[PDB]
């Protein structure tokens, strides 16, 4: 199935032009952020979707994530797989590495308090991680085999929740500037 849903959510400050194009297409510019998470993807995430993005642009100016972005319900998780960063490359508590589409990443977890989430403003959840030892290239039709992470972060008893929310290919930015273009199906 082709992208259904249009994740666009700032906070914190500075500019966030998201424009939602053609098909799976879209592009950020951003200056001077807070936070922000703008992608496209499903309304209803799947363990075992296989994601294809080509970002064709990624122009990141400090730190923005180029990654798969998705809740569970059941209990809360957000989660990732990082494919590429600009300054920062995230990380958090370490639990193995997985391969998947041509590269190895490192798996962490992390608990957020006080946090915003698709509950809202002041919550605690969990997030997963699965984050690149190196930078992806972009520009190629690229494929994120989820499942490959889903029976990874089980092996490592980080178990998602039995109700999905959304699931994207985003690009995120915390307190930096930079551009994006990306097509997700
Ligand atoms: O859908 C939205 C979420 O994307 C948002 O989650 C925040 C996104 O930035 C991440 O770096 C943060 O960890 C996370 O708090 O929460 C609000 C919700 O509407």
Redesign the pocket.
């Given at each position: 199935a082709s992208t259904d849903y249009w994740?666009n959510?700032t906070?914190g400050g500075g500019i966030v032009n998201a424009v939602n194009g053609s098909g799976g297409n879209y592009s950020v510019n951003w200056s001077n952020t807070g936070?922000?998470?703008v992608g496209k993807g499903w309304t209803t995430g799947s363990p075992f979707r296989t994601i294809n993005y080509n970002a064709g642009v990624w122009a990141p100016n400090g730190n923005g994530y180029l990654t798969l972005?998705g809740?569970t319900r059941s209990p809360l998780i957000?989660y990732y797989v990082v494919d590429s960063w600009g300054t920062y490359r995230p990380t958090g508590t370490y639990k193995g590495t997985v391969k998947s589409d041509g590269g190895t990443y490192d798996i962490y977890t992390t608990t957020?308090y006080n946090?915003?989430?698709?509950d809202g403003?002041d919550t605690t959840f969990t997030?997963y991680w699965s984050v690149r030892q190196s930078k992806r290239p972009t520009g190629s039709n690229a494929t994120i085999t989820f499942s490959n992470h889903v029976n990874a972060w089980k092996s490592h008893g980080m178990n998602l929740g039995s109700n999905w929310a959304?699931q994207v290919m985003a690009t995120?930015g915390?307190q930096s500037s930079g551009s994006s273009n990306v097509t997700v199906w």
């Open positions: 994740q959510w906070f936070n922000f998470v972005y809740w957000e957020r946090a915003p989430s698709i403003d997030q959304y995120e915390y």
